[PDB]
């Protein structure tokens, strides 16, 4: 958790939309079982990709406005932003290897 940005409706603009570079945002909630493994994988990704990718979390129960703005329909959902714009999304659980594939697919 030490390398994960904690986002809210009130910090999303500054921390994501105005952030230079790539940010991977995990839309989650406590009641989401699949979200638990995603979190464990994301800690490793955040560590391994330091300097190249920032990882962040947005709790959809607590920040329904942001969830609505991005059309979140189910969780987990990962949104990859580059320079403040959505570059890719992945809905539903995936393995660490699949996530690394998903990220590689988005390299310019
Ligand atoms: Cu940590």
UniProtKB/Swiss-Prot annotation:
Transmembrane segments: none annotated. It comes from Escherichia coli (strain K12). CDD domains: TRX_family. Belongs to the thioredoxin family. Monomer. Interacts with bacteriophage T3 DNA polymerase. It comes from the Bacteria. The active site is at residues 32, 35. Keywords: Acetylation, Disulfide bond, Electron transport, Host-virus interaction, Redox-active center, Transport. The record marks 26 as: Deprotonates C-terminal active site Cys. GO terms for cellular component: cytoplasm; cytosol. This is Thioredoxin 1. One of its GO terms (biological process) is cell redox homeostasis.
